[PDB]
Structures are given as C-alpha cells and as structure tokens.
C-alpha cells in the first residue's frame, strides 16, 4: 500500500505505538518494507530513545543492516541477544546474519585480541546447519579451535559434502591461499571426523600433510579392522616418507598383530606383485633394444645406450646380454654399467646377489664399486649388502673403497630411512673426515645422510650437518663441494614446518657467495610452499642479484613452491635473458603429465644453441612424457643432424622409455655442466617404480 | 521417381506415398491392445479433454459386431469411412453365411479394400492402421493389425501411434508366458501399459474390455485410480 497510513508512525514517542508498530513491521519485514527503506533519514533521529527496546534494536539493526554500515550494524544484535525454514528466516538469518555476523567476525577478529561473538558464531553455525548449504558458510566461518568445534559440532550425518567439498576446497585453498598454522587445525580436526569416518586414504593424505606416527597405528588397527589390502600397502609405502616406515617397523616390530604389516609396510610387498604382473599384462618388443639400442657407437652414446637399454625394465635380457660391452666401457661409465644391472632389476632380492656376485670383488675397482652401488639400487630392505661394502670403506685418503663408499654410502642411502639411523652416520664421520678429492665422496655423504634425514622432525641443526658445515667451511676448494654439501644440508632441513634453521645457518654460514649460495640453498629447501607470497616478492627482488647461481637455485625453487596452483607456474623466464633462467623454467616444467602449453614452451626451449641448454631440454622434455612422443625426438635429430647433444638425445630417449624421493635426485642433477665423473652419479636419481 | 505420384516406383524400387502415409499414423494417437486367454482388453491414450465440450463423440474404440472390436491411428476421417463401410460389410456377411463374423475375414476385407483403393488412379490412401480384436472360434482370442499398404499382420500384443517402439518395447519386457487367465493380471497388464504410456497423465486414459462373450465395457476413472495406486504399491514393494 501507500506509505501515508504507516509512515507517520515513527513520529510519536509513545511506547504502545512502538510496541505494536514493530510487530506490525515484523509482518512486513518478510520483504523488509514496500521498498529500499527510505524511512532511514527520519528514523535515525530515534537513536537516542530508550520496555520493548530490544525490539527497537531489531528495527534498528534491520534498517541499518538494510542500507549500509560495517560496525554499528551488528551492535544492536550483540545488544539484542536474538530472541522472540522461512522466507523471513532466510532474510534476517541467512543474508543479514551471514553478512552482518560475517563483518562482525571480521571486524572483531581483526580488532580485538569476546564470548559474545562466540555465542553468535555458534548460533549462526547452528542456523546454517539448518539451512544445510555448506560451502560458503564454511569458508566464512574458517576465518574465525573455533573451526574444530565447528566441525565436530557440524559432523553428524553428511559425510561427503563436508569431507569431499569442505576438505577439498579448504585443503586446496588452505595450501593455496591460507598460511600454514590453521592447516594443522584442518589436519587434526579432520583427523577427528575422518577418524569417525571410513575410506581411510583421506586420513592417509592427512598422514601425507601431518607426517604423524600415531596415525599409522590407528589406521593399521582400523585398516586391519577393514580387511585392496596389499594395494594400500603399495600406496602406503609410496605415500610414506623415510621416518614412519622405520618407526612403523619398530612399533610394529613390537606388536604387528598378524605380522603381515611387517610383511607389507616395510619393503618387499609393494614390489612382489608388480614385477611379475609387469611381465604379464605388458608385452614390450625388441626393436628398441635393437633399434634404439642400435643408435650407433662412440663409448659415450654407446655407453649411454647401455644405460638406456639397462633402464628397459620382456626379461632381464639386457642384463645378461653377454660380454665385451662393459669391456669397451671406461671408468665412470663402468660405474654406470656396473650399476645398470642394478637398474634393470629393482626387485629379485635373491637374484640380485647371484647376478651382481660375478661383478662383485672383480678385477676392476669400478666394477666392484658400481656393483655394490647396484646392490644399493635393487632394494631397500635387505641390509645384508652393507657389511661387504661397509667393512671395506675406510681408505684414509683416496683408495678403492672410497668409490665403494660413493656407491655404497649412496646405495645405503637408497636402502634405509630410520628414526635417525646413527650407526651409518658414525660411519659417515670418517667419510667427511676422510674428504677425498673425488667430489662424490662428500656428495653422496650429504645426499645420502639427507636421504636418511629428509622428513626430520622440523629438521635438526645437529652435529652431523653442523659438522659438515664446519668441515665444509674448513676447505674452500672445488666449488661442486660448495654446491652439493648445501644439497644435503637442505635435505636435512626438509621435514620442516616452522624451522628457524635458515636463520641459524644464516648466523653460522653466510659469507662470500659460496656460503651465501649455501644460504640460498637453505632458503630454497626450508620453504616447500604455502600461501606465503612474501618470499615470492623476495624472489622477485633477489632474483635480480648479480651473482647468477643463487639466481639458479633460488629461482629454481618455484616448481617446489607453486606445484599445486600450476596455472601461475607459466612465467616469463623464457622472456628473460640470463640463459640459466631459461634452464630454470626448463626444469620447472619437469615430468608430470605435461599439457599442450608445456610442450608449447618446448617449442622454443627445444630450439636453442648452447649445448648445456640444448642438452638441458630433452631431459625434462621426456620426463614430462613418460608422431607424438617420438616426434620431438626426431625433431632433435633434425636439430643436431655435438657429442653432448647426442648424449642429451640419448637421455631424452631414456626419458621417453610432495614425495621427497622424487624431489631429491633432480636437484642432485642440477650441476650437469661437467665431467662424466659427475655423470657416473647421474644414474642415481631413482624416482620411478 | 518422385513423392508424386502413387503409381510409379522409385529407381531403387520403392513407393513413396506408401512409405510416407505410414508417417501420418506414426504421428498419431497411441492405442494399445493385448489378448488375454479369455478376456481381451485394449485402450487409447490422449483423451485430451479441452474443458468446454463433450467427448462422447470422439470415441476411437468401437465395434462392428458384438464379437469384434476396433481401434485405429492416423487421421480420424479415414477411420470413420472405413468403419462405416466395415459395419455394412459385417452385416452383409451376416446376410450371407449365418456365422458370427470371423476376425480374419473382416481384416482381409478391410486390408483388401484399402489396397485396391490404393492401386487405383489418384485416390489418397487411408492413412490409418486399425486394431481388430475378437475371440470367435470357441473363444480363441485374436487381434490383427492393418497397414496403409493393406497388410493384415497377426500379433499377440500391439502398440501404435506416437512412440510405438518404446511402448511395444515395454511389452517385450512385460509379456511373459503366465499373463492370462489370470484375468486380474491381464487387467494389471493393461494398467502397466497405460502407466508405460508416453504421457501417462492418469485421467486421459480410456480403456475398453471384452470377456470374449459379453459386450464392450467402458470402465470408470476410479477403478483405474485404484489400479495406478496398486501399481505404485508394487513399485514401492520393489524398493
């Protein structure tokens, strides 16, 4: 109707006209009024007036909430103590209490730091449990633990909307936009409601982000309570890091309850179903052995081809293909070929000893040292290959068993990940105290103790890596030491959630840009990735640093950091000119499934002229795809047809055919512009089943 | 060779208007018909009462004799003329040999008339297809259908009009051996056919029965509501 009968009712100040007009306005409050509430300029004078004055607070929050305010709007509701499935309930509850209580939670969440906003917050939580459309109420009620009692208060009936919808969008947006400390509340209260619930790989991805040891005991009494079985042994062992299968095999070495979790969840039963079934359902032919194994000769390309043939795995045929192929081979390639029988067969525990045993203790140092390297390759649960190598290791400067130290300290780094294995590190004290002029002694020292030490409890600054810091800064020689020791330093820094070890090594370490490059290595490895863009604008500024190798690793951190929100991962690094930066993006594509935009970047990155960068393209190019596939390969044949390029092409052919185990060895590969002695360890980036 | 005329073939051996006149039937109202063992029953859909007139004149199910029952599809005028002729044919047959008229002879008459009507010079063929149900020889239930070409074609159940493939496909999944009789199950079979109809509006259903000895019985829209209620009860019992 017209506002002529109802409009001058705001003019009197008598109590009965208010106490019946406000219930009369409550009936018309289903649409608020006729219109956009142009009573405001006349009824804002009624502020100073004071029985049913909380109903006057309802009118006042109704009209101030009706037009616009950020702090004075929820003040009549916090003064009101709301009192006295509907359209009106959707109005004053849904949009008005959602937006109004939302700005009260934001304004007091940023302002003060009461219980009133907790009571209103639980009331709105209950009202949106009535409304039952989550998603927006949830993401609003994150920013007020509050979210803990919100989840256990909310979770009674609906499982997959809160679990799938809430835990999907808030897990992804929590690692994406939100900082870290509330993600622990996600993980613990999600451990509560998922502890109530079935389909346990939600809790196993909670074990992925948590890395908790109680969780695997609860999910093994519960996932033994739910008797597939060896398959969750498989992605259990794939999912788990270095620590919790050794803590798991020690507390389950105590209890075990059927001993089949000691069978599955240490080793050997992720791997017993696969390799026969790998032979069975797949049938791989011979003309890539012969054709791709025919790609000419030259003891390099041929040597690489042995590696390519070797990583073929239809039987361990290229293993037992005669003799005179390794006799053509030379020292560090003899390491690569002695380890290549390791690479053909990362299973066959009993067959590993009886195949490598001919090449064990042979006439050649590289055959025996790469042979124990192969013993470290083939398995990770044997630990009886240690002692024939372990006993020999000491040489005190540069004898044979230091190369067995390289293959056996590295291959034993492949072998075990304990709570903290300490006996092998007490063996590692005369290794770094030995300090051979061979790089990969301290190389596989840092990398191997890092593989022992990735997933440490927020890292540690213990005397192991503290000792290799002090003995690192002891000798400033052969800067590959100053690169690959901060490798294993940052590997021990992995396992962090909140580590101040960048500040600790910042105080101990920093100097002339060898150890400032150690500073940027700890800066890389301590910062795995979250919504933490301040180090990304730090990346923007110190990306322009005149020393152009802290540029290399510091800009190289990007594929670790933004690996999930990968749409921003295309950047203009190719549009820059510091050619190692084009190398950095060339790393940053990598190996996943590799969409058309990535191969489109390999359109330009495929065509470059420097042999380390033209060498650098087919590696990640054929890692990212594990004609179509062979079309860029024959395009590389069109590129060259140097020797490096030929080797790079061979590597690409090999490629053609946050788990830390796939995170380490390519950052171990990042110093490739060097000797084949370095490439003798190039075959230790064991990141594929 | 062309859609005109009826007299010349296609170059690949077809008649266009014979093939095209069936489309008028195929866009027509749906009418089904099954045979029981003792009681035969059928019905049309799309009564389509337009709120201001009577519908006792639009009845698509009639009879020529007390023993035979009708249905059709396509356009209504050809059905009017064919049935008005067929009544006189039935009565002329009765004026001859004193039997109750067999369903087979009158179907041969109707399809034969339709065909020799088609063969002639420029006569538009009757775009209908009739359903001719009777049980004459010791109460042997028979139902034949016709065609615009004029081919009588004996079935056990039948479905024509709009969406006849789906409606006949329901009878493929419905018509087991032990349908009838079991007259109540034949009743529920007609009810399930009406529920499986293209619209199944519930009040636009019009069905007529014959117990092979009685007369044609038009049912009531309260018995059918009970039938839909017990069919929904069977659907709930499936749950």
């Amino acid at each position: 109707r017209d506002k002529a009968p109802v409009q001058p009712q705001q003019s009197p100040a008598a109590a009965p006209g208010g106490t019946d007009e406000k219930p009369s306005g409550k009936e018309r409050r289903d649409a608020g009024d006729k219109d956009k509430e142009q009573e405001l300029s006349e009824e804002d004078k009624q502020l100073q007036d004071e029985l049913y004055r909380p109903a006057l607070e309802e009118l006042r929050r109704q009209i101030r909430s009706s037009t616009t305010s950020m702090t004075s709007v929820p003040k009549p509701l916090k003064f009101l103590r709301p009192h006295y499935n509907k359209r009106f309930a959707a109005d004053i509850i849904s949009v008005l209490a959602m937006t109004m209580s939302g700005e009260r939670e934001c304004l007091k969440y940023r302002l003060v730091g009461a219980g009133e906003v907790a009571k209103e917050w639980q009331e709105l939580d209950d009202a949106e449990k009535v409304q039952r459309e989550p998603l927006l109420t949830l993401v609003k009620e994150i920013v007020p633990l509050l979210m803990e009692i919100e989840q256990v208060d909310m979770l009674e009936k609906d499982i997959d909307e809160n679990a799938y919808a809430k835990v999907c969008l808030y897990l992804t947006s929590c690692v994406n936009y939100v900082p870290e400390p509330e993600n622990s509340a996600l993980l613990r209260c999600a451990l509560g409601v998922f502890r109530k619930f079935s389909r346990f790989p939600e809790a196993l991805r909670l074990a992925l982000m948590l890395n908790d040891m109680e969780l695997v005991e609860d999910i093994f009494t519960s996932c033994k309570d739910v008797v597939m079985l060896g398959r969750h042994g498989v992605f259990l062992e794939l999912s788990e890091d270095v620590e919790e299968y050794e803590d798991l095999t020690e507390i389950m070495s105590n209890v075990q309850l059927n001993s089949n979790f000691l069978a599955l969840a240490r080793e050997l039963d992720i791997m017993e179903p696969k390799v026969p079934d790998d032979i069975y359902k797949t049938h791989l032919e011979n003309n890539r052995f012969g054709g791709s194994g025919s790609q000419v000769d030259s003891a390099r390309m041929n040597l690489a081809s042995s590696f390519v043939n070797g990583f073929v795995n239809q039987d361990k045929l290229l293993t037992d293909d005669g003799n005179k192929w390794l006799y053509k081979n030379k020292d560090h390639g003899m390491l690569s070929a002695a380890a290549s029988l390791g690479m053909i067969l990362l299973w066959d525990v009993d067959g590993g000893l009886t195949q490598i045993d001919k090449y064990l203790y042979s006439s050649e140092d590289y055959i025996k040292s790469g042979a124990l390297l192969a013993c470290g390759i083939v398995n990770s649960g044997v630990r009886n290959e240690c002692d024939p190598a372990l006993a020999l290791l000491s040489d005190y400067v540069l004898h044979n068993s230091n190369t067995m130290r390289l293959g056996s300290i590295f291959g034993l780094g492949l072998a075990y990940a304990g709570s903290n294995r300490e006996d092998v590190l007490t063996l590692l004290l005369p290794v770094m105290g030995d300090s051979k002029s061979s790089m990969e002694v301290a190389g596989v020292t840092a990398l191997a103790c890092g593989m022992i030490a990735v997933g440490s409890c927020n890292g540690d600054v213990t005397s192991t890596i503290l000792q290799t810091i002090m003995e690192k800064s002891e000798t400033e020689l052969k800067d590959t030491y100053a690169r690959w020791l901060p490798l294993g330093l940052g590997l021990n820094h992995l396992g962090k959630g909140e580590a101040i070890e960048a500040i600790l090594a910042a105080l101990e370490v920093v100097s002339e840009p060898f150890r400032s490059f150690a500073n940027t290595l700890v800066d890389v490895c301590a910062y795995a990735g979250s919504g933490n863009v301040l180090k990304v604008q730090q990346l923007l500024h110190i990306c322009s640093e005149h020393f152009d190798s802290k540029e290399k690793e510091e800009d190289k951190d990007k594929k670790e950091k933004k690996d999930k929100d990968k749409k921003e991962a295309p950047a203009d690094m190719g549009a820059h000119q510091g050619v190692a930066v084009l190398g950095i993006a060339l790393i940053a594509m990598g190996e996943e499934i590799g969409a058309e935009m990535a191969l489109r970047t390999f359109g330009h990155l495929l065509r470059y002229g420097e042999p380390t960068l033209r060498r650098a393209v087919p590696l990640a190019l054929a890692l990212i795809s594990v004609s179509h596939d062979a079309d860029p390969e024959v395009s590389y044949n069109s590129i060259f047809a140097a020797r490096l390029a030929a080797m790079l092409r061979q590597l690409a052919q090999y490629h053609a055919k946050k788990g830390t185990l796939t995170l380490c060895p390519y950052h171990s590969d990042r110093q490739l512009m060097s000797q084949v002695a370095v490439a003798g360890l190039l075959t230790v980036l064991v990141s594929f089943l | 060779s062309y859609d005109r005329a009826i007299t010349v073939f296609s170059p690949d051996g077809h008649l266009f208007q014979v093939e095209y006149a069936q489309e008028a039937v195929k866009k027509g109202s749906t009418a089904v018909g099954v045979r029981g063992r003792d009681i035969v029953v059928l019905g049309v859909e799309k009564k389509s009462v337009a709120k201001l007139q009577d519908e006792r004149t639009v009845r698509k199910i009639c009879a020529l004799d007390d023993n035979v029952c009708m249905a059709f599809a396509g356009l209504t005028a050809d059905a009017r003329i064919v049935i008005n002729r067929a009544r006189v044919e039935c009565q002329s047959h009765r004026l001859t040999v004193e039997d109750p008229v067999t369903v087979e002879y009158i179907t041969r008459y109707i399809a034969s008339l339709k065909q020799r009507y088609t063969q002639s010079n420029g006569r538009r063929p009757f775009g209908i297809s009739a359903l001719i149900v009777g049980f004459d020889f010791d109460g042997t239930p028979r139902l034949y259908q016709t065609d615009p070409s004029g081919t009588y074609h004996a079935w056990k159940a039948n479905a024509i009009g709009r969406g006849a493939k789906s409606v006949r496909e329901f009878l493929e999944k419905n018509y087991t051996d032990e349908a009838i009789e079991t007259d109540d199950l034949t009743i529920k079979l007609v009810i399930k056919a009406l529920l499986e109809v293209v619209q199944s509006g519930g009040k636009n259903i019009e069905l007529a029965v014959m117990r092979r000895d009685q007369s044609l019985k038009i049912l009531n829209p309260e018995e059918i509501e009970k039938y839909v209620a017990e069919i929904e009860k069977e659907k709930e019992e499936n749950e």
Binding site: S627, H628 | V198, Q199
Partner: protein, 370 residues
C-alpha cells in the same frame, strides 16, 4: 564481492601485456637494409642469388637476397622486403594473416568438456578413437600398422548436440580448428565455390595437422536461391570440386574431416562411401534416463529448491533433446525473474513445460489428425 579481484587481475593482465647498440654486425645488417624498406611479391625463384619479384603496379626485377634470412623461407606467392636503391630482396615479411584465418581458425577451446554430454558414451568413444587417438596417442597404429578412420558424420534430429560435440572436440584439442557452415558455399558469381574449397583446404593443409568441421552440409543439395548465378550446373561443380578435394591425391594429410547433418536422405552416395568417410555415426535421441543428466548439468550452477521430480518431465513428451531441457531451464528462469524469486519452484517448471512443448512441438491445426 569478487569484482575487486576481477578488475585488479584484468588491469594487471592488460598492463603486463603492454610491457613489451650492443650488436654491431646486426646494425651492419640494418645498414644493408634500406631506410625505405619497400615490399613486393614473388613470381619465380632462380638459384643465382637473385629471383624475379613484382612491384605493386607491375614492374619486375632480378634482385638479390640479403643472406642472413634464408631463401628456403621464400615460396612463390609470398610477400617480401625490397630495397629502393637496387630493389634487392631484403628479408622475410610475416605473412598476410588473412580474414580466413581470423574468422575460421578458432583459437579458443570454447565451452564445457565431455562432462556436458547427454545420452553419450559410445559416440564419444567413437570420435575419441577416430580423432583424438589418431591425434594424441597414435602408438597403436605402430603396434598394428593400420590406417586411422578418416571421416565422421553426425546425424539426427535438430537440437541433438551436433553443435555440442563440435564444441567438445574443439575443447579438448591441440590442433588448429576450422569451422564452416554449409550454407556459405553459394555466392553471387560464377565459379566461387571451388575457389573457396581450394583456398579453405589449402590453408587447412599449410599450417599443421588440423580438424575441418563443416555443419549443415545438406544445405547445398536441397536449396535454391534467386541469389544464384548458373545454378544446379554450378552446384554440381561445387560438389565435384569438394568431391575431388576430399578423396583426391598426394597424401591428403592429418586433417580429420568431420561433417554434421540433420537429414541424411538427400545426400550423394558418392560422398558417404568410405575412403572419404569411414565412421558414420548415428545420433538418435538416446534414452529417457539421461534426460536427468541434462537436467542435472544444466541446473548444476543455478540455485533451485527440491520441489520437482524429473520423472514428471520424463512422462510429458516422447522426443527428448538438450534443446528441450535447456529451453525448460531458460523459460524457468524467465518465469523466475517474472515472479522475482530464486530457488526455482514447481509452478515455473509446469508453465515452462507446457509453453515449451507448445512452442514448439505440435503439428498441425485441428484436425489433422487427431
């Protein structure tokens, strides 16, 4: 509330897009180039470092090439860089990116992917293994040694998803897409169809492996116009040129040719034979069950109450399409903004149902039949 980030990211995108000596040999090559670097067109190429060009008005010269940019870039029928002082060929010009490319070569993966189907999951698998599997993963043709199937025909009732599947293959793509509506192939001149055919499929064959999609190709056999010179004895010539184009010579190339029709009866039997088209594909109106999937998808991003059963919209009409269900959704939205609500109720569906079945499916004024 998302307008802030939208506007800020849009402005940042535009400003970063608008963000676009040391070398003396390059400057010497600059000085070998003229200051008025004129532009010409080639006729023939002679091996003796110089070839014949043509000017704008038609003067022609034997002029040599600045050889740091390659002459293998040069083909007969290209636009080049010429000098004024000896008119020498200076370098390669980027080509005339003609309006055939800017119209037809759609750069954009248009809309929703294979989760926008209804009643599919065999024909998706057919078009997948006939186009995508020859495109993305043709390692199985190594494994056996067999030709991929060539041509695809989409046919059925109007509103079935010919348009939808055409947008679907152009969504998941890595090759250059071309699109032609079949009514374009008659112009107001004598002999313009074969020129369109040759230039169209030449541009299709020149860039890359590609996909040519043409739709409503039946609009050339059963259509006449007063805007037509010659007539059937030029329609037949257009058909015959496309006939030689499709099943011709010289290793046609990795250009998947996909066609889509409403009717199928009025088409050339010489064009539905294999060699040309190996995978004819039926589009029937599939089932009364995936009606609910199209109601699910086309209401997956609109707030709606429960208040309805899709079985009420299954037992209403006998022919089913996405053209039915999307019309129901849009008319329900019209009835929603007509009654200024959200969370669309049942009466909008009922009035939308009746008004959409009437407009249009009835045929014809009563009566007939009835």
């Amino acid at each position: 509330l998302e307008r802030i980030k939208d506007y800020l990211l849009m402005e940042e995108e535009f400003i970063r897009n608008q963000e676009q000596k040391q070398e003396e040999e390059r400057s010497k090559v600059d000085d070998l180039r003229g200051t008025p670097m004129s532009v010409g067109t080639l006729e023939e190429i002679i091996d003796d470092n110089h070839a014949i060009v043509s000017t704008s008005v038609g003067s022609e010269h034997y002029v040599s090439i600045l050889s740091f940019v390659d002459k293998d870039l040069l083909e007969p029928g290209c636009s080049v860089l010429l000098n004024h002082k000896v008119h020498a060929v200076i370098g390669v010009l980027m080509d005339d990116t003609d309006p055939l490319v800017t119209v037809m070569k759609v750069e954009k993966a248009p809309q929703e992917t294979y989760a926008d189907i209804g009643g599919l999951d065999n024909q998706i698998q057919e078009i997948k293994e006939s186009v995508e599997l020859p495109l993305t993963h043709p390692e199985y043709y190594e494994e056996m040694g067999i030709k991929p199937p060539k041509g695809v025909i989409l046919y059925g009732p109007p509103g079935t998803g010919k348009t939808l599947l055409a947008k679907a293959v152009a969504n998941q793509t890595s090759a250059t897409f071309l699109r032609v509506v079949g009514s374009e192939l008659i112009q107001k001149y004598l002999g313009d169809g074969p020129k369109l055919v040759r230039e169209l499929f030449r541009v299709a064959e020149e860039h890359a492996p590609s996909i040519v999609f043409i739709d409503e190709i039946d609009a050339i056999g059963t259509k006449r116009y007063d805007s037509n010179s010659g007539g059937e004895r030029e329609i037949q010539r257009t058909m015959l040129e496309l006939l030689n184009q499709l099943d011709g010579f010289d290793s046609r190339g990795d250009v998947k040719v996909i066609m889509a029709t409403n009717r199928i009866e009025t088409l050339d039997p010489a064009l539905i034979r294999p060699g040309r088209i190996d995978r004819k594909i039926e589009f029937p109106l599939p089932d009364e069950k995936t009606k609910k999937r199209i109601f699910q998808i086309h209401t997956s991003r609109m707030t709606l109450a429960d208040d309805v059963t899709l079985d009420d919209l299954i037992m209403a009409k006998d022919d089913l399409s996405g053209a039915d269900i999307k019309a129901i959704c849009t008319e329900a939205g019209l009835m929603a903004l007509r009654e200024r609500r959200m969370k669309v109720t049942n009466e909008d569906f009922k009035k939308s149902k009746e008004n959409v079945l009437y407009k249009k499916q009835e045929g014809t004024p009563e009566g007939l039949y009835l």
